[PDB]
Design a protein around this ligand. Structure first.
Ligand SMILES: [Se]
Ligand SMILES: [Se]
Lengths: 304, 304
């Protein structure tokens, strides 16, 4: 037993991380089959980033302006293309370490693993959530850009995130692997608003179920409530409204614990109104919203 | 910028995880060169675990009673040996994926990555600390036993932990890769006391420095203090006493932030006496003690 923020094992993604250099700028790319994927702002200087015309900047670049390195192997670029905010560099070699993979666009509130990379070398792995406002709260230093977010289903890596920028507010924005930003963000060094973040209510509930399963039961109260009444209290506390879709997704946890979703909601209501009174749940003094119901079931039943 | 509990990339260890079966019992082993390492209690039934004589139980076992499987490849066992609480199975094949490695015994308060495994297949990776009382607060379901803890220095994997048991209290105990338990624990299903856990004071301080670096400065106070006076307050709050060795280890963070270790101690003192007043530091409502100063520098300077 026990409960931990667990990332996916990163081996399959490690073998895909390359170093991409165009003029002075170096960042991470992802080498799958005969294509390398990286942030298009690899073609920008510091000054370019103030107001980039990517089409005009890219037009000054030939295949040979792009230095792609996999460990000590330099790859040869035989084609380049801009797809939204990503560059696709066609290289002459299929990555021998290409895992089975999909590109997917994830939903606000879903989680994924990030392999934080510098100079195309992996430094570490952590789990996080796409916030409702489509930011992530990562750890990304200079040259982490092009570090990827992913999920694993058995043998298949589902890439969902590529890191492009830190906002002036210290949170992180990037794209799917087709180069569409999550959220209203652009790849430009300008002031950009994330907008109000909300708690992922369905995730918090998932974690309360995880807590019950690991014997942390003190917050279980004698009340119940209604979906409408709950959402009325959620609204006050900048919690995302809970839908019947959400109630359904929690069913298997309802079934394991013999606790009805609506009673767990009433428990949540009282924590929101009363705080924690200086107690902890699963080692935390605040309500945790970075586990999906799927993550909780995974860890509680031990999927590989 | 930003700050996250980051594990090491797990690829090098993934390629070493095998499935070990002896009679009915299956758990994880670690395949390095021509040796497989696993918990010796793989030779125990449920009933054996109540009061095992491992020497007598092991004597009923030949090389052929041990089914070692690496993916679909079954390995051949040509030798078996008990070293303390681990079994060393000599197999005919050197693991082609053997990384450069060391076995190391870590100190209370040091951190490492766990690759949580089921049936010799990796399920996930998280970072944790050896507690002063030599337990870990993991996530380990049935058959996770033999899952390993490690650190990585560039190309070299330093294995420091093998999971053997959950205590009746829900925390986790295991051994180094020579099979010596961390702490007073034995591989027997009996009541065993962990003893009082204490906070890793040097780690908390490291994290306060991390907090300052990421602009979380509100807890910085107008006081200072003495090492003796600080430790007097530490003792009351079950914080580990701070030594000059610890002061020294924090030097580079002192140097980056222009904040003297003793002034950061005075900050800590007031948090310990006053709590957090319902504020957060780096997203947490409690004082975090699972980052070493080394971990903080790693993440703040981006080592690969
Ligand atoms: Se970047
Ligand atoms: Se075990």
């Amino acid at each position: 037993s026990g409960f931990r923020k667990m990332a996916f094992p990163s081996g399959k993604v490690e073998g895909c991380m390359v170093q991409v250099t165009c003029g002075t700028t170096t960042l991470n790319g992802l080498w799958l089959d005969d294509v390398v994927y990286c942030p298009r702002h690899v073609i920008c200087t510091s000054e370019d980033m103030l107001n980039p015309n990517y089409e005009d900047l890219l037009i000054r670049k030939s295949n040979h302006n792009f230095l792609v390195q996999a460990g000590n192997v330099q790859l040869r670029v035989i084609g380049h293309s801009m797809q939204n905010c990503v560059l696709k560099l066609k290289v002459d070699t299929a990555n021998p370490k290409t895992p089975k993979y999909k590109f997917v666009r994830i939903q606000p509130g879903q989680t994924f693993s990030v392999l934080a990379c510098y100079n195309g070398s992996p430094s570490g792995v952590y789990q996080c959530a796409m916030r409702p406002n489509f930011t992530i709260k990562g750890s990304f230093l200079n040259g982490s850009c092009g570090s990827v977010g992913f999920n694993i289903d058995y043998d298949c890596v589902s890439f969902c995130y590529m890191h492009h920028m830190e906002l002036p507010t210290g949170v992180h924005a990037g794209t799917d692997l087709e180069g569409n930003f999550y959220g209203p963000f652009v790849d430009r060094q300008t002031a950009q608003a994330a907008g109000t973040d909300t708690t992922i209510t369905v995730n918090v509930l998932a974690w309360l179920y995880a807590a019950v399963i690991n014997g942390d039961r003190w917050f279980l109260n004698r009340f119940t409530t209604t979906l409408n009444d709950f959402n009325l209290v959620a609204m006050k506390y900048n919690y995302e409204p809970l839908t019947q879709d959400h109630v359904d997704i929690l069913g298997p946890l309802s079934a394991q614990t013999g606790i009805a979703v609506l009673d767990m909601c009433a428990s949540l209501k009282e924590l929101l109104q009363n705080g924690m009174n200086g107690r902890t749940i699963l080692g935390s003094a605040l309500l945790e919203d970075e586990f999906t119901p799927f993550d909780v079931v995974r860890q509680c039943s031990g999927v590989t």
